[PDB]
Write a protein that binds this ligand. Structure first.
Ligand SMILES: CCCCCCCCCCCCCCCCCC(=O)OC[C@H](COP(=O)([O-])OCC(O)COP(=O)([O-])OC[C@@H](COC(=O)CCCCCCCCCCCCCCCCC)OC(=O)CCCCCCCCCCCCCCCCC)OC(=O)CCCCCCCCCCCCCCCCC
Ligand SMILES: CCCCCCCCCCCCCCCCCC(=O)OC[C@H](COP(=O)([O-])OCC(O)COP(=O)([O-])OC[C@@H](COC(=O)CCCCCCCCCCCCCCCCC)OC(=O)CCCCCCCCCCCCCCCCC)OC(=O)CCCCCCCCCCCCCCCCC
Ligand SMILES: CCCCCCCCCCCCCCCCCC(=O)OC[C@H](COP(=O)([O-])OC[C@H](O)COP(=O)([O-])OC[C@H](COC(=O)CCCCCCCCCCCCCCCCC)OC(=O)CCCCCCCCCCCCCCCCC)OC(=O)CCCCCCCCCCCCCCCCC
Ligand SMILES: CCCCCCCCCCCCCCCCCC(=O)OC[C@H](COP(=O)([O-])OCC[N+](C)(C)C)OC(=O)CCCCCCCCCCCCCCCCC
Ligand SMILES: CCCCCCCCCCCCCCCCCC(=O)OC[C@H](COP(=O)(O)OCCN)OC(=O)CCCCCCCCCCCCCCCCC
Ligand SMILES: CCCCCCCCCCCCCCCCCC(=O)OC[C@H](COP(=O)(O)OCCN)OC(=O)CCCCCCCCCCCCCCCCC
Ligand SMILES: CCCCCCCCCCCCCCCCCC(=O)OC[C@H](COP(=O)(O)OCCN)OC(=O)CCCCCCCCCCCCCCCCC
Ligand SMILES: CCCCCCCCCCCCCCCCCC(=O)OC[C@H](COP(=O)(O)OCCN)OC(=O)CCCCCCCCCCCCCCCCC
Lengths: 98, 169, 80, 105, 48, 171, 110, 120, 347, 42
């Protein structure tokens, strides 16, 4: 297929493996998650603008809004984590091993 | 060179994601995702999606990454080998992809991809006195009734959920 | 309904103006006689091409020329 | 569970955005409207198991309209043979493929 | 051009159906110069 | 698959209407009133055949009927027309509303010397009818035969034989 | 193309001015300054209220993103449905604001 | 499996052609078993709240029996309907495809040779 | 929590699952999952302790990752099909990504790694919602995409879920982790019979929801979250020991009980398709689940562990808890096997 | 079945509520004239 789809999919997989291999922070995880959402926005947008399918032009906006609301939820979760340990470190979230 | 410009922007786009997928710090991660959003917006603008690209600016960057940098600046009190190694790893993977698809005009990582510039796939007609993208977004209120109901209900519930889980009571 | 309205207009006039403007915005298109003309102007704006019909032999109300009398007229839009 | 509430109650919640051949605003056709209309009218009612083998021609036409992979492969072959014949000096472009012919209308 | 290549059908449709297909941008402006390419493929988008 | 059949370059040669877009837009309403019939023949042919190669000769008639529109302007009213499309040509959006006295002079001169009446608001967007002699396309999509549907359900509904037949359940 | 040239020109002028501001007074050979705040060295206390006004911004900005196609949506032929859904979106934004009010969300930054 | 059969008329618990079928009697052993489940639900409801198990809430036990018989009657009707639809589709398909269901030559055991295996 | 807000949030959870069930467009499927997660987050953080916030964080990360893989599968479906119908998938890459996304939403192994954590961190009612209601929407999408599900993928996920959910609960003394590993094993049982007969998938889902709702309702009635706290039940409420006895003997698949019904029918639809090794290995692996069910019945019903003195006070207060549908669910989760041919109502 | 790895695990609390494990002090000094020491709670 088209050559720009290669780069947008590979960007999605780069941000996937960033979101699938944490270092320390939960904020860097949410950044990788929203990079995944951004790459989905770009890819759905390039398809819908390519094929001239008119009614799906409202589709990525929806894909923005919900997922941006999703990001808000995650940020609040992070803040509750940072209201317990003082950092947003993912290694402090191990109380449920037992 | 200029006929490949979206491709070139897309390369910067992939580079921008390695700017934060290696996760140097969440503030440098935020900066990398801002530059990535700008170039991906430019990619959206070059297929004719002006309104969608300005949603990437107004809502993704100027709306949401503002809140990411805001929340991050309220943490990570102000003052790597793995970061730079993973960064050059992803960069060399992407430039090997560039070199392969520019020397072969064909590549297959998971799907087959053409090596010519993406100007070839476009349409050769006009849309008259409307942008088809603008009218498909204007269709959200006439044809998109159920979508507006469920989206507005999810945003109202989102406000309620954010107020519940941050109260602590 | 009378003392309460004067009380909320004395304490919180911004909110009273808010709910009054929103209430007029809700109810007044259902009562306006010009709401129909918005519909009739938006459907009379020709974004596309009026793709003509094959004259099979019995279409008495479809014109053969734009300046023919039969067909949709917009004298209401010129006059109002 | 596919509780088909829309067909039961007669409401149209999400069928309009489902296909490209549906009713679009201002009658805008998609770039593969005819191919998708032919694939849908082929594969209608006969089930997916029959439709994967009895509508393969319409679906290959529609997929190759969408992605243009055979078209771009053919353009790759034409352009690469043209570049080889330019490099070997066996071919020259015409004046109308150089920009010196004052285009038609 | 495509005289040397074995087994090539000139003007062969990549589509199975004989219906007219709207020409792609690369089908029309493929063999032309990059100036006409850019003017046809990003002219309106880049215009001011 | 098959070879696509394109017309030769002799089939595409026609006397091109080489006027600018402001000349077209200034002369637009009288072109839509006076060159109605072969234009609508052509556009009916163009939406029914769905193939421009089947619509060439009618298009030539369009390119024949447009030029006779402009020569008949050039024989009688070249000066008010030139003054009108120059003022249309000045504007960036090519507004009609900036150019009403030149339109008035052009419409007065055309209505006197050629008897043409400008279409009223709402007329050129009417859906008209075209009497043609070409046949209706019985397969404009070049569609093949559709697959035959699955057989329906019919007849009366008898009960299940000996119940459910699930291993030992007698009902 | 004109826009990309304009953006590049503005970025180049801004970078030139920033470079002149960060490097022209460096050539002053004034003096080395020995031993170059209300809180001394305490950590930054997290304010829940700043995060609350930021997330309230984000959610109402999403509702704004839904409202942004309205000058194009007034041009439709299905105006009763369009008007109902537009008033319903602005009403749900107002219900979000009223719920943010009455559950003490707009407090000490009211 | 039969999801294309009940897709032309979706979300019908009992369609119209279900009325062509005989309904279960009120003395159905399956319906009596579901009434017994209602009685067991009533006894367990009195046992978990420390009530006299047979004595307390005869109105409540009777509503348990009534509600389970009421739900189970329609469940049994739909059950018999779906097995009748299964058999109807089977028989229509065997009638429409005779080449996939040939009539077998039933041979008597005077021609049928089975290998004998002595147990010793 | 405000009870009005609780009612609106539970209706929004139910609304998101219904929007997944009733929609024909993929964007509305994704919207239903987003609405469902966004509304179930406060149900997990109801008691406001760091275990609930950690559990909600882990749940958010896994379900967000699954939703992103779901939308990527949908976008690749629009690439290779040009349309949005919730039906079969027109690319094996999109089929693989959607099967992965739904496996992450269900907690099927090796994406099971969030289910015993989150169920431990949240209350018993929210864990009941997570293990019963939150299995409905991904199994509905797996019901509707099964002409494109790869066989070896779904069977690998199924046997790996059955084996890992079997060996999980043998080491567990916490009841919510026991129900979580039971969830992983039973979801493997549901997806194993998926491509062969999805009616038996629906039967297994309904019987599992009934039995899990019975066990969580008994856990909420007795206010026990550990095995050793559940062992105090005979001195307080002796009928509840009989109820957890018959329900845990049902959940192990022991005849003549109703929980024997699904797995038997699963075998009944897998030996038709000439798979004999796979339902045999699955049935033998279910003995692990039955072993820790027997461990719980030994601790609760069949022996009498020593209680304490303060239990004598609780003899003087009857249960004021609304044990909703507990006799109905207890009867349905045990005495339903003579009504086995009722499964044709799910066809 | 406690192994060597799962030996440092204690059982969770009975109500499943964990223990949670300072207000800002500002010096608005001389930089008429006045020094202020602020104890602020936000
Ligand atoms: C009938 C069966 C279902 C009955 C459920 C309730 C039983 C009950 O409450 O009994 C107590 C009650 C006597 O006790 P009580 O004085 O009222 O109060 C309780 C005591 O204080 C008890 O004192 P306590 O609780 O303080 O301490 C003693 C302790 C003693 O407990 C212990 O020490 C702990 C446990 C001991 C070891 C475990 C023993 C086994 C228990 C489980 C059973 C397993 C086998 C089942 C099948 C195998 C699969 C698991 O606990 C009990 O005894 C609890 C009371 C209940 C005992 C019986 C439990 C029955 C429910 C489970 C079986 C039925 C449902 C599942 C069936 C599965 C498939 C067949 O017994 C009865 O009333 C029995 C019924 C007598 C009349 C029957 C009439 C039938 C008429 C039928 C026709 C009319 C209807 C027509 C309908 C159709 C119309 C169309
Ligand atoms: C069809 C689908 C049905 C789905 C289930 C609907 C009900 C359960 C869900 C909602 C709920 O929890 O409601 C409370 C629930 C009672 O459950 P609970 O919390 O355990 O209460 C225990 C005692 O009722 C505690 O006694 P109490 O003193 O608090 O109140 C006495 C109460 C007084 O009741 C009333 O006052 C209700 C009448 C007024 C209702 C509103 C009218 C306006 O008596 C009863 O409710 C007797 C129990 C009735 C049977 C409950 C189960 C119904 C059937 C469920 C499906 C069975 C399927 C079997 C299939 C087997 C083969 C596969 O149901 C009712 O109160 C109404 C039952 C109505 C049954 C109608 C059946 C046919 C419908 C057509
Ligand atoms: C004039 C207008 C009015 C006309 C009125 C006409 C009727 C007059 C009499 C009124 C009463 C009628 C009663 C129903 C008809 C007869 C049903 C019958 O006996 O079926 C024989 C049935 C098959 O025998 P058959 O020789 O082939 O058929 C004779 C008839 O043609 C059977 O007829 P069928 O071929 O139509 O039967 C259909 C089918 C025939 O059956 C089959 O196709 C075979 C499969 C049956 C299910 C097997 C499941 C195995 C795994 C689970 C084991 C469950 C636990 C076992 C028991 C634990 C302790 C309760 O039945 C089913 O599928 C229903 C499921 C089984 C329930 C049977 C009815 C129970 C009613 C009373 C409920 C009280 C509790 C009973 C015990 C609960 C457990 C069953 O026998 C069994 O399956 C053995 C199990 C026990 C049967 C229940 C006996 C009913 C009377 C019980 C009185 C004592 C209660 C003591 C207190 C409570 C328990 C502690
Ligand atoms: C709360 C619901 C508020 C909006 C109610 C519907 C408003 C409306 O005009 O709907 C018509 C619209 C659109 O109908 P319409 O009148 O525009 O239909 C003409 C056909 N088209 C769209 C092609 C021009 O929606 C429907 O008919 C169905 C979707 C909404 C149905 C109600 C859902 C309620 C959910 C409650 C939970
Ligand atoms: C196999 C699948 C992935 C293929 C690409 C691999 C890229 C190179 C990275 C390999 C792992 C390097 C590493 O040490 O990762 C660990 C690190 C998190 O560990 P941390 O505690 O931060 O550092 C101490 C090291 N144990 O983890 C990370 O920092 C991982 C960051 C991943 C970002 C991926 C960037 C793009 C990679 C190319 C495209 C895929
Ligand atoms: C139906 C029309 C559409 C309605 C929805 C659209 C609304 C558009 C405007 C958006 C409003 C968003 C915010 C609403 C918040 C309402 C709650 C509120 O503010 O209550 C508190 C307030 C008293 O203020 P207090 O809490 O004391 O503030 C501290 C500072 N002193 O309490 C008050 O001041 C009392 C407020 C309630 C009574 C207002 C009555 C106004 C009547 C105007 C005339 C009739 C208009 C028709 C509609 C009537 C609807 C009720
Ligand atoms: C107690 C159950 C109450 C049921 C009330 C009626 C509900 C109804 O009308 O359901 C329709 C549905 C059959 O409709 P259908 O289009 O075949 O569904 C496709 C499923 N994949 O019917 C069914 O699915 C019937 C079976 C429902 C059983 C639910 C409890 C177990
Ligand atoms: C093809 C299939 C299609 C779909 C079929 C239908 C699927 C049904 C799925 C059922 C899912 C049930 C989820 C849980 C119930 C929802 C409401 C809820 O949250 O109830 C719990 C509630 C919370 O009360 P709270 O104050 O939090 O208590 C804490 C202790 N102080 O209250 C309590 O804690 C009270 C204690 C008792 C609660 C018992 C609730 C039982 C609910 C399940 C009934 C069985 C399912 C329906 C029948 C079978 C259908 C398959």
């Amino acid at each position: 297929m088209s050559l720009v789809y290669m780069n947008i999919m590979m960007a999605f997989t780069v941000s996937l493996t960033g979101l699938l291999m944490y270092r320390s922070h939960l904020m860097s995880s949410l950044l990788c998650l929203e990079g995944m959402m951004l790459s989905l926005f770009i890819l759905a947008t390039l398809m819908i603008l390519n094929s001239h399918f008119t009614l799906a032009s409202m589709m990525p906006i929806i894909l923005l809004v919900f997922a941006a609301c999703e990001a808000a939820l995650g940020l609040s979760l992070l803040v509750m984590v940072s209201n317990t340990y003082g950092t947003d470190y993912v290694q402090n979230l191990n109380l449920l091993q037992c | 060179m200029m006929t490949y410009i979206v491709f070139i922007l897309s390369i910067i786009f992939v580079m921008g994601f390695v700017g934060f997928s290696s996760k140097p710090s969440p503030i440098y991660g935020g900066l990398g995702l801002i530059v990535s959003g700008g170039v991906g917006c430019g990619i959206v603008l070059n297929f004719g999606g002006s309104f969608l690209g300005l949603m990437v600016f107004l809502i993704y960057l100027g709306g949401m990454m503002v809140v990411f940098g805001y929340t991050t600046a309220m943490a990570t009190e102000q003052y790597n080998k793995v970061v730079l190694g993973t960064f050059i790893t992803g960069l060399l993977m992407e430039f090997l992809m560039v070199y392969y698809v520019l020397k072969d005009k064909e590549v297959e990582i998971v799907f087959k991809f053409n090596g010519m510039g993406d100007w070839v796939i476009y349409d050769t007609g006009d849309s008259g006195f409307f942008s088809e993208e603008a009218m498909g977004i204007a269709a959200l209120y006439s044809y998109g009734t159920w979508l507006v109901i469920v989206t507005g209900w999810s945003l109202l519930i989102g406000v309620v959920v954010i107020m519940e889980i941050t109260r602590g009571n | 309904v009378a003392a309460f309205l004067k009380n909320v207009w004395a304490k919180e006039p911004v909110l009273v103006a808010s709910f009054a403007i929103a209430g007029l915005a809700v109810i007044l298109p259902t009562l306006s006689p010009y709401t129909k003309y918005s519909l009739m102007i938006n459907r009379a704006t020709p974004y596309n091409y009026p793709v003509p019909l094959r004259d099979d032999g019995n279409m008495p109300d479809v014109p053969s020329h734009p300046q023919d009398p039969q067909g949709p007229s917009l004298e209401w839009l010129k006059r109002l | 569970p596919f509780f088909d509430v829309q067909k039961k109650l007669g409401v149209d919640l999400d069928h309009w955005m489902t296909i490209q051949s549906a009713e679009q605003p201002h009658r805008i056709p998609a770039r593969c409207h005819a191919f998708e209309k032919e694939w849908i009218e082929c594969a209608h009612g006969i089930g997916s198991i029959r439709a994967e083998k009895e509508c393969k021609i319409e679906f290959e036409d529609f997929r190759e309209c969408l992605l243009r992979q055979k078209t771009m492969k053919r353009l790759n072959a034409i352009k690469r043979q043209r570049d080889k014949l330019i490099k070997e000096g066996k071919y020259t472009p015409p004046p109308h493929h150089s920009g010196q012919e004052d285009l038609r209308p | 051009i495509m005289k040397d290549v074995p087994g090539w059908k000139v003007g062969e449709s990549v589509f199975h159906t004989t219906r007219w297909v709207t020409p792609m941008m690369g089908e029309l402006y493929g063999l032309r110069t990059g100036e006409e390419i850019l003017s046809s493929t990003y002219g309106f988008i880049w215009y001011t | 698959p098959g070879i696509v059949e394109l017309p030769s370059l002799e089939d595409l040669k026609v006397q091109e209407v080489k006027v600018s877009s402001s000349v077209l837009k200034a002369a637009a309403h009288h072109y839509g009133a006076q060159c109605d019939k072969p234009n609508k023949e052509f556009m009916l042919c163009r939406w029914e055949e769905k193939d421009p190669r089947r619509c060439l000769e009618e298009g030539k008639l369009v390119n024949q009927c447009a030029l006779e529109f402009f020569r008949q302007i050039k024989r009688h009213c070249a000066e008010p027309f030139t003054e009108y499309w120059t003022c249309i040509d000045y504007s960036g959006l090519q507004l009609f509303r900036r150019c009403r006295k030149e339109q008035a002079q052009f419409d007065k001169c055309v209505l006197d010397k050629l008897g043409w009446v400008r279409p009223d608001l709402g007329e050129l967007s009417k859906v008209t009818k075209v009497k043609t002699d070409r046949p209706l396309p019985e397969n404009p999509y070049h569609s093949r035969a559709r697959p035959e549907p699955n057989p329906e359900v019919e007849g009366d509904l008898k009960p299940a034989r000996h119940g459910s037949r699930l291993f030992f359940w007698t009902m | 193309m004109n826009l990309m040239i304009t953006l590049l020109t503005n970025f180049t002028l801004a970078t030139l001015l920033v470079t002149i501001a960060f490097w022209l007074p460096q050539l002053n050979v004034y003096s080395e300054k020995t031993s170059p705040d209300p809180m001394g060295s305490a950590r930054l206390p997290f304010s829940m209220k700043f995060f609350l006004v930021a997330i309230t911004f984000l959610l109402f900005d999403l509702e704004i993103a839904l409202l942004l196609p309205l000058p194009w949506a007034s041009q439709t032929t299905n105006l009763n449905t369009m008007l109902t859904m537009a008033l319903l979106l602005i009403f749900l934004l107002a219900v979000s604001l009223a719920y943010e009010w009455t559950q003490k969300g707009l407090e000490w930054t009211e | 499996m039969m999801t294309g059969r009940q897709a032309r008329a979706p979300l019908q618990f009992l369609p119209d052609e279900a009325r062509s079928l005989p309904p279960p009697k009120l003395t159905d052993p399956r319906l009596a078993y579901i009434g017994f489940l209602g009685y067991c639900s009533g006894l367990i409801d009195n046992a978990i709240r420390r009530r006299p198990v047979l004595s307390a809430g005869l109105h409540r036990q009777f509503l348990y029996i009534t509600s389970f018989v009421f739900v189970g009657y329609y469940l049994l009707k739909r059950q018999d309907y779906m097995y009748a639809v299964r058999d109807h589709d089977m028989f229509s398909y065997i009638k429409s495809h005779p080449e996939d269901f040939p009539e077998k030559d039933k041979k008597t055991y005077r021609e049928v040779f089975e290998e004998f295996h002595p147990v010793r | 929590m405000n009870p009005i807000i609780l009612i609106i949030i539970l209706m929004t959870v139910m609304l998101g699952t219904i929007i997944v069930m009733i929609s024909t467009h993929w964007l509305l499927i994704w919207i239903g999952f987003e609405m469902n997660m966004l509304a179930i987050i406060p149900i997990m953080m109801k008691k406001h302790n760091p275990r609930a916030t950690e559990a909600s964080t882990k749940y958010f990360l896994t379900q967000s990752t699954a939703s992103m893989l779901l939308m990527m599968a949908i976008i690749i479906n629009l690439m290779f099909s040009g349309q949005w119908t919730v039906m079969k998938l027109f690319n094996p890459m999109a089929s693989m990504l959607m099967t992965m996304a739904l496996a992450m939403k269900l907690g099927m192994a090796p994406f099971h790694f969030w289910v015993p954590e989150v169920t431990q961190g949240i209350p018993l009612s929210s864990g009941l919602i997570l293990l019963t209601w939150q299995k409905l929407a991904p199994m509905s999408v797996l019901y509707q995409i099964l002409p494109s599900i790869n066989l070896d993928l779904i069977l690998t996920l199924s046997i790996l879920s059955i084996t890992i959910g079997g060996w999980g609960g043998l080491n567990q003394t916490q009841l919510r982790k026991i129900m979580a590993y039971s969830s992983i094993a039973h979801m493997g049982w549901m997806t194993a019979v998926l491509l062969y007969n999805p009616t038996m998938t629906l039967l297994n889902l309904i019987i599992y929801i009934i039995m899990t709702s019975t066990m969580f309702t008994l856990f909420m009635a007795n206010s026990t979250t550990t095995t050793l706290s559940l062992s105090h039940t005979w001195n307080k409420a002796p009928i509840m020991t009989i109820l957890v006895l018959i329900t845990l003997l049902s959940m192990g698949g022991l005849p003549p009980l109703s929980g024997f019904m699904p797995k038997w029918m699963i075998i009944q639809e897998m030996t038709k398709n000439d798979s004999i090794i796979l339902p045999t290995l699955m049935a033998i692996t279910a003995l692990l689940n039955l072993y820790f069910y027997m461990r719980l019945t030994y601790s609760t019903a069949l022996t009498m562990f020593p209680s304490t003195n303060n239990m004598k006070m609780k003899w003087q207060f009857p249960t004021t808890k609304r044990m909703t549908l507990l006799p109905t669910m207890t009867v349905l989760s045990t005495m339903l096997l003579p009504l086995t041919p009722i499964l044709s109502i799910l066809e | 079945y406690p192994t060597k790895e799962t030996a440092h695990w204690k059982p969770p609390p009975w109500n499943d509520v964990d223990p949670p494990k300072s207000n800002l002090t500002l010096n608005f000094g001389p930089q008429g004239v006045l020094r202020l020491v602020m104890e602020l709670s936000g």
